[PDB]
Amino acid sequence: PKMKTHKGAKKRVKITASGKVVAMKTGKRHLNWQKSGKEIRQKGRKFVLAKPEAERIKLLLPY
Amino acid sequence: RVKMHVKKGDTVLVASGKYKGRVGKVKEVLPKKYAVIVEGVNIVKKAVRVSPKYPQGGFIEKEAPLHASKVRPICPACGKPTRVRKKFLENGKKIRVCAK
Amino acid sequence: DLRPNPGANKRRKRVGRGPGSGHGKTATRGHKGQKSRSGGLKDPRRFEGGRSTTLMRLPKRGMQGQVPGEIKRPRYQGVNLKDLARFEGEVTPELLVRAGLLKKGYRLKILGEGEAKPLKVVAHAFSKSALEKLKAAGGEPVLLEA
Amino acid sequence: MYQIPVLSPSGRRELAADLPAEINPHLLWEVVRWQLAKRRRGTASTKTRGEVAYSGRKIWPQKHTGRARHGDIGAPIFVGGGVVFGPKPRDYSYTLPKKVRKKGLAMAVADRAREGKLLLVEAFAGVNGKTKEFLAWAKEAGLDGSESVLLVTGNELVRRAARNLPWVVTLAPEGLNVYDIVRTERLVMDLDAWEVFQNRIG
RNA sequence: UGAAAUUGAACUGGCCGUGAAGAUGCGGCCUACCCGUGGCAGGACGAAAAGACCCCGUGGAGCUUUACUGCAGCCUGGUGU
RNA sequence: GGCGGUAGGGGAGCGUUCCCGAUGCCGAUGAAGGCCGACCCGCGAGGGCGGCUGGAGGUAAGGGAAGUGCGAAUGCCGGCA
RNA sequence: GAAGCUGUUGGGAAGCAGCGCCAGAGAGGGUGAAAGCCCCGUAGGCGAAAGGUGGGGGGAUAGGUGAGGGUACCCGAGUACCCCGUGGUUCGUGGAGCCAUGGGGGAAUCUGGGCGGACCACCGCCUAAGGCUAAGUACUCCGGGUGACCGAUAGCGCACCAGUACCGUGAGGGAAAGGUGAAAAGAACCCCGGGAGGGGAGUGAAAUAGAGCCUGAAACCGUGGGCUUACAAGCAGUCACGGCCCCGCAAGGGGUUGUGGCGUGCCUAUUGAAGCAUGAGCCGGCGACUCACGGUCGUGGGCGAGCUUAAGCCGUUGAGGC
RNA sequence: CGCGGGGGGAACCUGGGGAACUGAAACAUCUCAGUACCCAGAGGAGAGGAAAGAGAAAUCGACUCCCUGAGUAGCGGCGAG
Ligand SMILES: [Mg+2]
Ligand SMILES: [Mg+2]
Ligand SMILES: [Mg+2]
Ligand SMILES: [Mg+2]
Ligand SMILES: [Mg+2]
Ligand SMILES: [Mg+2]
Ligand SMILES: [Mg+2]
Ligand SMILES: [Mg+2]
Ligand SMILES: [Mg+2]
Ligand SMILES: [Mg+2]
Ligand SMILES: [Mg+2]
Ligand SMILES: [Mg+2]
Ligand SMILES: [Mg+2]
Ligand SMILES: [Mg+2]
Ligand SMILES: [Mg+2]
Ligand SMILES: [Mg+2]
Ligand SMILES: [Mg+2]
Ligand SMILES: [Mg+2]
Ligand SMILES: [Mg+2]
Ligand SMILES: [Mg+2]
Ligand SMILES: [Mg+2]
Ligand SMILES: [Mg+2]
Ligand SMILES: [Mg+2]
Ligand SMILES: [Mg+2]
Ligand SMILES: [Mg+2]
Ligand SMILES: [Mg+2]
Ligand SMILES: [Mg+2]
Ligand SMILES: [Mg+2]
Ligand SMILES: [Mg+2]
Ligand SMILES: [Mg+2]
Ligand SMILES: [Mg+2]
Ligand SMILES: [Mg+2]
Ligand SMILES: [Mg+2]
Ligand SMILES: [Mg+2]
Ligand SMILES: [Mg+2]
Ligand SMILES: [Mg+2]
Ligand SMILES: [Mg+2]
Ligand SMILES: [Mg+2]
Ligand SMILES: [Mg+2]
Ligand SMILES: [Mg+2]
Ligand SMILES: [Mg+2]
Ligand SMILES: [Mg+2]
Ligand SMILES: [Mg+2]
Ligand SMILES: [Mg+2]
Ligand SMILES: [Mg+2]
Ligand SMILES: [Mg+2]
Ligand SMILES: [Mg+2]
Ligand SMILES: [Mg+2]
Ligand SMILES: [Mg+2]
Ligand SMILES: [Mg+2]
Ligand SMILES: [Mg+2]
Ligand SMILES: [Mg+2]
Ligand SMILES: [Mg+2]
Ligand SMILES: [Mg+2]
Ligand SMILES: [Mg+2]
Ligand SMILES: [Mg+2]
Ligand SMILES: [Mg+2]
Ligand SMILES: [Mg+2]
Ligand SMILES: [Mg+2]
Ligand SMILES: [Mg+2]
Ligand SMILES: [Mg+2]
Ligand SMILES: [Mg+2]
Ligand SMILES: [Mg+2]
Ligand SMILES: [Mg+2]
Ligand SMILES: [Mg+2]
Ligand SMILES: [Mg+2]
Ligand SMILES: [Mg+2]
Ligand SMILES: [Mg+2]
Ligand SMILES: [Mg+2]
Ligand SMILES: [Mg+2]
Ligand SMILES: [Mg+2]
Ligand SMILES: [Mg+2]
Ligand SMILES: [Mg+2]
Ligand SMILES: [Mg+2]
Ligand SMILES: [Mg+2]
Ligand SMILES: [Mg+2]
Ligand SMILES: [Mg+2]
Ligand SMILES: [Mg+2]
Ligand SMILES: [Mg+2]
Ligand SMILES: [Mg+2]
Ligand SMILES: [Mg+2]
Ligand SMILES: [Mg+2]
Ligand SMILES: [Mg+2]
Ligand SMILES: [Mg+2]
Ligand SMILES: [Mg+2]
Ligand SMILES: [Mg+2]
Ligand SMILES: [Mg+2]
Ligand SMILES: [Mg+2]
Ligand SMILES: [Mg+2]
Ligand SMILES: [Mg+2]
Ligand SMILES: [Mg+2]
Ligand SMILES: [Mg+2]
Ligand SMILES: [Mg+2]
Ligand SMILES: [Mg+2]
Ligand SMILES: [Mg+2]
Ligand SMILES: [Mg+2]
Ligand SMILES: [Mg+2]
Ligand SMILES: [Mg+2]
Ligand SMILES: [Mg+2]
Ligand SMILES: [Mg+2]
Ligand SMILES: [Mg+2]
Ligand SMILES: [Mg+2]
Ligand SMILES: [Mg+2]
Ligand SMILES: [Mg+2]
Ligand SMILES: [Mg+2]
Ligand SMILES: [Mg+2]
Ligand SMILES: [Mg+2]
Ligand SMILES: [Mg+2]
Ligand SMILES: [Mg+2]
Ligand SMILES: [Mg+2]
Ligand SMILES: [Mg+2]
Ligand SMILES: [Mg+2]
Ligand SMILES: [Mg+2]
Ligand SMILES: [Mg+2]
Ligand SMILES: [Mg+2]
Ligand SMILES: [Mg+2]
Ligand SMILES: [Mg+2]
Ligand SMILES: [Mg+2]
Ligand SMILES: [Mg+2]
Ligand SMILES: [Mg+2]
Ligand SMILES: [Mg+2]
Ligand SMILES: [Mg+2]
Ligand SMILES: [Mg+2]
Ligand SMILES: [Mg+2]
Ligand SMILES: [Mg+2]
Ligand SMILES: [Mg+2]
Ligand SMILES: [Mg+2]
Ligand SMILES: [Mg+2]
Ligand SMILES: [Mg+2]
Ligand SMILES: [Mg+2]
Ligand SMILES: [Mg+2]
Ligand SMILES: [Mg+2]
Ligand SMILES: [Mg+2]
Ligand SMILES: [Mg+2]
Ligand SMILES: [Mg+2]
Ligand SMILES: [Mg+2]
Ligand SMILES: [Mg+2]
Ligand SMILES: [Mg+2]
Ligand SMILES: [Mg+2]
Ligand SMILES: [Mg+2]
Ligand SMILES: [Mg+2]
Ligand SMILES: [Mg+2]
Ligand SMILES: [Mg+2]
Ligand SMILES: [Mg+2]
Ligand SMILES: [Mg+2]
Ligand SMILES: [Mg+2]
Ligand SMILES: [Mg+2]
Ligand SMILES: [Mg+2]
Ligand SMILES: [Mg+2]
Ligand SMILES: [Mg+2]
Ligand SMILES: [Mg+2]
Ligand SMILES: [Mg+2]
Ligand SMILES: [Mg+2]
Ligand SMILES: [Mg+2]
Ligand SMILES: [Mg+2]
Ligand SMILES: [Mg+2]
Ligand SMILES: [Mg+2]
Ligand SMILES: [Mg+2]
Ligand SMILES: [Mg+2]
Ligand SMILES: [Mg+2]
Ligand SMILES: [Mg+2]
Ligand SMILES: [Mg+2]
Ligand SMILES: [Mg+2]
Ligand SMILES: [Mg+2]
Ligand SMILES: [Mg+2]
Ligand SMILES: [Mg+2]
Ligand SMILES: [Mg+2]
Ligand SMILES: [Mg+2]
Ligand SMILES: [Mg+2]
Ligand SMILES: [Mg+2]
Ligand SMILES: [Mg+2]
Ligand SMILES: [Mg+2]
Ligand SMILES: [Mg+2]
Ligand SMILES: [Mg+2]
Ligand SMILES: [Mg+2]
Ligand SMILES: [Mg+2]
Ligand SMILES: [Mg+2]
Ligand SMILES: [Mg+2]
Ligand SMILES: [Mg+2]
Ligand SMILES: [Mg+2]
Ligand SMILES: [Mg+2]
Ligand SMILES: [Mg+2]
Ligand SMILES: [Mg+2]
Ligand SMILES: [Mg+2]
Ligand SMILES: [Mg+2]
Ligand SMILES: [Mg+2]
């Protein structure tokens, strides 16, 4: 009774004012040793998901 | 307690079925069963004898316990419901207009 | 108008589905007909495959939180001056919450686009932009202090 | 609407009500359902295979027995077992939004007003709580018993009077409610009542 | 005097086909009046037992060790008595 | 002009229990249930009518709420084979 | 503790008809069927010598209540405090404080001492290591009230002489079983029979209400009647025709089955079953997608830059309101 | 010699002890859960209770219970929870 906000999710995802799900980019914290500048740069931004988008949305809600 | 009801042993009118309008005195009242016997209901007990002692014991037609709600008390008229006026000491049932 | 026919206005058919029958949703009942259709299925929401969910993504949500927890500090809510402009007289933190916006968030901040009423407007902070729109029409005082 | 006939020793005067123009039947169906829901007392219970009186033991082994296969008499597939999704006590009530509650009361009163059945009065000449009195009193009032009358007044004595009547339903001013309004073919009320009605909505 | 397991219902034949690849029940053909009693065990993939073998389940349990981790026990420094 | 259909999606309906309707109406000139029909209305689940039983209940129109429909679960209880 | 009597159908009226009556009472139960006015009640009201309870009201006692100046006496010890091992908290060693404490070391008495999340400073808060304290809260063995709760396979395991009979060494398991009729009027007496049990007589409105007796379903057993069968090949039907028997003016219709054509049970599981793959002897009853909270979309409404109240309070006793 | 204890009570209460299945789709930290259960004691309740309090307001003012605060702040093999 009373759903629990999936703390593990909110700790890594943001819900955009329109209704989209934004999350950081993977692949930039380790594998690196000399990846292009182009790589790491584009790994700094954040993005959007699509269908799993709708999966997480449900794990928050009170949020 | 409270098993008690309308009249005791005395004159009463039958507003029942097969003896409506009939009249008689009540010769017994069975509170444990809420019924009274008058002189009205009478059924034939073809029975030989109730208890083995005594050879003959009768086809007696005797009176069948009448349900106490089919009998109304009566005095100088046609039998009224019972009121209760207490005297200056005791208490006794005045009918719808008179004593006793 | 009697107790006959107040009847629910032709749309509320409480008609739940019964799948215990012989023609409708039969036998298997509802959509099933297979297996792992018994007590219940794993999640899905997040969990499943049993591979990596998508919890492959990661928490840039640094400043996730400390032990003693929340750090209390003044919270400013923006009330857009176009909505403020609505009513008149002289607006204050109380009047604003007292009527629709704010709600004891406590810190009042007129800002945003619209058209300033020539009224006085006590607040906790003005947007640069808001400051001017109202500057060229009326009076504008700052917050108490603490 | 507006054409409410008032009654008094000074004769029949007439008032002007602020009652709503139109009646939404569904709203009344919503308000009545709400009223009949809250009085619903939750009280039906049955026992799960857990609350049933039997023991845990496995009735018999489940292997080379030829018999079916089982756990314990509790199992709902036994006669004298537990019941399945059988009822448990529950609160049927809910909070029908206040705007709605009032709309209803207004529309109810109105529906009767528009039917002409509504009749405010003040002239209660038959006082001392005594059915006979109110009986004769209603005779004058045009209430004979051909139609059901929801009587609403502050005076407990007028209540006492009408109360025992099988074509009347007594009720205080605050008691006003759609169900009772709708029940009876005829609304009739005290001015002090009609007033405290407008108090609620006017 | 009088049971039992079994029992979808039966109006329950042979061959050669046939079919989920072993047919009283479909095809064709052949044989055969109706109902029992005593007796035989070829078929009814006959009864019995939700195959013990085998595999599957991120099932269980007993057992082993230089599998992992832990506990008893023991050994040991420091300290209290 | 369309209209085979499993898993499945959608729609419309029938019937059982209970509530408002009900201080009412049906009812010993016969309630519920049971038995029977070659009748009537419904595509249908059903509904109605009639005779026989039965001996006291039953509950429209329009709504409302569910312990609401069984052929199978080596299902459960009983009866009989 | 109010107010009804007559007629009529009936085994029996409480029904139907006539006229009439109470109601602070037309809740409900009963009386031969369906009753405000017959009975028991109900509305309203009355009551305790004795036991219990009882600041609610009233009375008494215990107890309690002031200012300034000076002195520094006192202000809970193996305690605080730090360390080691832990528990509690949202806190899993985490920057880990707070409360508690098993081991070790071990103070102070207001210029004392604890705390405000390591520590330090500043500024605040608070006085540990003695104790007690009503109400608001939890529960239902017990009594009462009420139900869009059950109605004997339901409802508590038990409506009934059930924690029984019976099973188990024992802990413990744990049933089945309710209904004549308004009244017993429960069937005198005769008849066949050892009895049981029948037939007649009799009671009753009714006895296929006759005593584990209301209704009395299905499987299952049986007698009688109609149609049919001993040269026939079978999922038992179905289509056609003919015979025979029964309804009906009729034309039609009902029952049966002779011959002819056609035809591989139901469910399940499955690429695929009549299948020699699963389940089921048959009938009756019990039997499986709910509910609470929270979500999401659709939907019928109310209000709209707003919308809505929770617990609770008043009210009511099927009234709402704040 | 005098007053008291002893034993019992459906559920409820406090204190001393205190699991595993199961969840994590394996499992060990973790969860189930300080629940189940055992023990002692209280009583119509029990516990708690007048601040070495809370915590940011130069604010509050015993305890208990309900609503909310809030699935927030946090905790977490940052998994499941
Ligand atoms: Mg938005
Ligand atoms: Mg938002
Ligand atoms: Mg949006
Ligand atoms: Mg990386
Ligand atoms: Mg960069
Ligand atoms: Mg929120
Ligand atoms: Mg006498
Ligand atoms: Mg004699
Ligand atoms: Mg006389
Ligand atoms: Mg069903
Ligand atoms: Mg369908
Ligand atoms: Mg389908
Ligand atoms: Mg189907
Ligand atoms: Mg299946
Ligand atoms: Mg689940
Ligand atoms: Mg990272
Ligand atoms: Mg945060
Ligand atoms: Mg400007
Ligand atoms: Mg007018
Ligand atoms: Mg409208
Ligand atoms: Mg038991
Ligand atoms: Mg038990
Ligand atoms: Mg149990
Ligand atoms: Mg067990
Ligand atoms: Mg087995
Ligand atoms: Mg068997
Ligand atoms: Mg079982
Ligand atoms: Mg079990
Ligand atoms: Mg049983
Ligand atoms: Mg039982
Ligand atoms: Mg039960
Ligand atoms: Mg008019
Ligand atoms: Mg009229
Ligand atoms: Mg043969
Ligand atoms: Mg052949
Ligand atoms: Mg054969
Ligand atoms: Mg063929
Ligand atoms: Mg052949
Ligand atoms: Mg033989
Ligand atoms: Mg022989
Ligand atoms: Mg053989
Ligand atoms: Mg042999
Ligand atoms: Mg054979
Ligand atoms: Mg063989
Ligand atoms: Mg097997
Ligand atoms: Mg594995
Ligand atoms: Mg394993
Ligand atoms: Mg093992
Ligand atoms: Mg080694
Ligand atoms: Mg070695
Ligand atoms: Mg070790
Ligand atoms: Mg040592
Ligand atoms: Mg040592
Ligand atoms: Mg030593
Ligand atoms: Mg067409
Ligand atoms: Mg179709
Ligand atoms: Mg539908
Ligand atoms: Mg009638
Ligand atoms: Mg007639
Ligand atoms: Mg019925
Ligand atoms: Mg019924
Ligand atoms: Mg009929
Ligand atoms: Mg209806
Ligand atoms: Mg069910
Ligand atoms: Mg089926
Ligand atoms: Mg069965
Ligand atoms: Mg049997
Ligand atoms: Mg059986
Ligand atoms: Mg047998
Ligand atoms: Mg009386
Ligand atoms: Mg009369
Ligand atoms: Mg005459
Ligand atoms: Mg006549
Ligand atoms: Mg007569
Ligand atoms: Mg009469
Ligand atoms: Mg009549
Ligand atoms: Mg009079
Ligand atoms: Mg009562
Ligand atoms: Mg009547
Ligand atoms: Mg009555
Ligand atoms: Mg009284
Ligand atoms: Mg006194
Ligand atoms: Mg006295
Ligand atoms: Mg008191
Ligand atoms: Mg003194
Ligand atoms: Mg003094
Ligand atoms: Mg001094
Ligand atoms: Mg000193
Ligand atoms: Mg000491
Ligand atoms: Mg010391
Ligand atoms: Mg000291
Ligand atoms: Mg010392
Ligand atoms: Mg120490
Ligand atoms: Mg100290
Ligand atoms: Mg410290
Ligand atoms: Mg140490
Ligand atoms: Mg150490
Ligand atoms: Mg420590
Ligand atoms: Mg502990
Ligand atoms: Mg800890
Ligand atoms: Mg926690
Ligand atoms: Mg922890
Ligand atoms: Mg800690
Ligand atoms: Mg400490
Ligand atoms: Mg210590
Ligand atoms: Mg301390
Ligand atoms: Mg503090
Ligand atoms: Mg600090
Ligand atoms: Mg402090
Ligand atoms: Mg102190
Ligand atoms: Mg101290
Ligand atoms: Mg102290
Ligand atoms: Mg103290
Ligand atoms: Mg203390
Ligand atoms: Mg105390
Ligand atoms: Mg309570
Ligand atoms: Mg009770
Ligand atoms: Mg009671
Ligand atoms: Mg009740
Ligand atoms: Mg009821
Ligand atoms: Mg029984
Ligand atoms: Mg029973
Ligand atoms: Mg029965
Ligand atoms: Mg039975
Ligand atoms: Mg009991
Ligand atoms: Mg008992
Ligand atoms: Mg006995
Ligand atoms: Mg007993
Ligand atoms: Mg018993
Ligand atoms: Mg017994
Ligand atoms: Mg016994
Ligand atoms: Mg024995
Ligand atoms: Mg024994
Ligand atoms: Mg049994
Ligand atoms: Mg018995
Ligand atoms: Mg006798
Ligand atoms: Mg005889
Ligand atoms: Mg003789
Ligand atoms: Mg003889
Ligand atoms: Mg003899
Ligand atoms: Mg005999
Ligand atoms: Mg005899
Ligand atoms: Mg005879
Ligand atoms: Mg006779
Ligand atoms: Mg008759
Ligand atoms: Mg009979
Ligand atoms: Mg017998
Ligand atoms: Mg009867
Ligand atoms: Mg025959
Ligand atoms: Mg024959
Ligand atoms: Mg015939
Ligand atoms: Mg014949
Ligand atoms: Mg043949
Ligand atoms: Mg044929
Ligand atoms: Mg004929
Ligand atoms: Mg004719
Ligand atoms: Mg002709
Ligand atoms: Mg015929
Ligand atoms: Mg074919
Ligand atoms: Mg299979
Ligand atoms: Mg297969
Ligand atoms: Mg398939
Ligand atoms: Mg076969
Ligand atoms: Mg096989
Ligand atoms: Mg088979
Ligand atoms: Mg299989
Ligand atoms: Mg099967
Ligand atoms: Mg078999
Ligand atoms: Mg068998
Ligand atoms: Mg059945
Ligand atoms: Mg809307
Ligand atoms: Mg209340
Ligand atoms: Mg003493
Ligand atoms: Mg004691
Ligand atoms: Mg004690
Ligand atoms: Mg504890
Ligand atoms: Mg402990
Ligand atoms: Mg395990
Ligand atoms: Mg495992
Ligand atoms: Mg824990
Ligand atoms: Mg505990
Ligand atoms: Mg002790
Ligand atoms: Mg004790
Ligand atoms: Mg206390
Ligand atoms: Mg204490
Ligand atoms: Mg103190």
Short mmCIF file of C-alpha atoms in Angstrom, two decimals, chain C residues 30-142:
data_model
loop_
_atom_site.label_atom_id
_atom_site.label_comp_id
_atom_site.label_asym_id
_atom_site.label_seq_id
_atom_site.Cartn_x
_atom_site.Cartn_y
_atom_site.Cartn_z
CA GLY C 30 -8.19 -13.36 -19.25
CA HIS C 31 -5.10 -13.44 -21.38
CA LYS C 32 -3.03 -16.41 -20.30
CA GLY C 33 -2.99 -19.92 -21.88
CA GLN C 34 0.72 -20.60 -21.22
CA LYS C 35 2.76 -20.47 -17.96
CA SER C 36 4.45 -18.09 -15.53
CA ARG C 37 0.74 -17.13 -15.26
CA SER C 38 0.18 -18.44 -11.78
CA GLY C 39 0.77 -16.26 -8.73
CA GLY C 40 2.52 -13.39 -10.51
CA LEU C 41 5.39 -12.25 -12.77
CA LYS C 42 8.67 -10.67 -11.63
CA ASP C 43 8.31 -6.91 -12.06
CA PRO C 44 8.41 -5.62 -14.93
CA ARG C 45 8.57 -1.84 -14.40
CA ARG C 46 12.30 -1.96 -13.75
CA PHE C 47 13.38 -5.50 -13.02
CA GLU C 48 13.99 -7.93 -15.70
CA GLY C 49 15.45 -10.12 -18.30
CA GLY C 50 17.64 -10.79 -15.33
CA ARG C 51 20.50 -9.21 -17.21
CA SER C 52 21.03 -5.53 -16.39
CA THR C 53 17.63 -3.82 -16.50
CA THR C 54 18.85 -0.52 -17.80
CA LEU C 55 20.53 0.20 -14.42
CA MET C 56 23.55 0.23 -16.72
CA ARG C 57 22.97 4.04 -16.78
CA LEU C 58 24.52 6.04 -13.93
CA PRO C 59 24.07 8.61 -11.12
CA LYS C 60 25.35 12.06 -12.06
CA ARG C 61 23.00 12.88 -9.23
CA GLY C 62 26.03 13.73 -7.15
CA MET C 63 25.07 15.44 -3.94
CA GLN C 64 22.87 12.39 -3.48
CA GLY C 65 22.69 13.14 0.25
CA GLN C 66 24.59 13.04 3.54
CA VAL C 67 23.94 11.24 6.85
CA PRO C 68 22.28 13.84 9.05
CA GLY C 69 20.39 14.46 5.84
CA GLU C 70 18.58 17.46 4.43
CA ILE C 71 20.29 20.80 5.04
CA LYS C 72 17.56 23.28 5.92
CA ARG C 73 17.73 26.54 3.98
CA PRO C 74 15.40 29.27 2.60
CA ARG C 75 13.41 28.14 -0.41
CA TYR C 76 12.33 30.71 -2.98
CA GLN C 77 9.17 30.15 -4.97
CA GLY C 78 8.63 32.25 -8.06
CA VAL C 79 5.24 33.82 -8.56
CA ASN C 80 4.97 35.20 -12.07
CA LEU C 81 3.95 38.87 -12.03
CA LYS C 82 1.32 38.35 -14.74
CA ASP C 83 -0.65 36.27 -12.25
CA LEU C 84 0.19 38.70 -9.47
CA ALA C 85 -1.04 41.55 -11.63
CA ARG C 86 -4.45 39.86 -11.71
CA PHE C 87 -5.76 41.30 -8.45
CA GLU C 88 -4.83 44.69 -7.04
CA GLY C 89 -4.31 46.96 -4.03
CA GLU C 90 -0.97 45.98 -2.52
CA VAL C 91 0.49 42.48 -2.61
CA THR C 92 2.45 40.77 0.16
CA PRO C 93 3.74 37.25 0.82
CA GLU C 94 0.62 36.56 2.87
CA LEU C 95 -1.95 37.83 0.39
CA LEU C 96 -0.23 35.84 -2.37
CA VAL C 97 -0.41 32.50 -0.53
CA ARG C 98 -3.73 33.52 0.97
CA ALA C 99 -5.19 33.35 -2.54
CA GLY C 100 -3.57 30.61 -4.65
CA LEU C 101 0.21 30.79 -5.08
CA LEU C 102 3.06 30.32 -2.58
CA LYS C 103 1.52 28.04 0.05
CA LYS C 104 3.91 28.87 2.89
CA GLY C 105 6.95 27.96 0.83
CA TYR C 106 7.65 31.25 2.56
CA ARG C 107 10.05 32.90 0.11
CA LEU C 108 8.27 35.14 -2.39
CA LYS C 109 9.85 35.96 -5.73
CA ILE C 110 7.91 37.96 -8.31
CA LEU C 111 9.42 37.44 -11.74
CA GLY C 112 8.68 36.56 -15.34
CA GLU C 113 6.66 38.02 -18.19
CA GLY C 114 3.35 39.86 -18.26
CA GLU C 115 2.30 43.41 -17.48
CA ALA C 116 2.99 45.10 -14.17
CA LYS C 117 0.17 46.67 -12.18
CA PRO C 118 1.02 50.14 -10.78
CA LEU C 119 0.63 48.56 -7.32
CA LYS C 120 3.11 48.20 -4.47
CA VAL C 121 4.68 44.74 -4.30
CA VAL C 122 6.57 43.49 -1.25
CA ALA C 123 8.65 40.40 -2.03
CA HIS C 124 11.83 38.49 -1.15
CA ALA C 125 13.47 38.95 -4.55
CA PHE C 126 12.73 40.33 -8.00
CA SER C 127 13.98 39.02 -11.32
CA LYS C 128 16.08 41.58 -13.20
CA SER C 129 13.39 41.54 -15.86
CA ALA C 130 10.52 41.70 -13.40
CA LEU C 131 12.19 44.54 -11.55
CA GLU C 132 12.04 46.78 -14.61
CA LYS C 133 8.55 46.01 -15.90
CA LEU C 134 7.19 47.06 -12.52
CA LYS C 135 9.74 49.84 -12.11
CA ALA C 136 8.12 51.50 -15.12
CA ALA C 137 4.62 51.45 -13.60
CA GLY C 138 4.74 51.30 -9.79
CA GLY C 139 6.53 50.78 -6.47
CA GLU C 140 8.65 47.85 -5.36
CA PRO C 141 10.04 47.12 -1.85
CA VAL C 142 12.39 44.33 -0.80
#
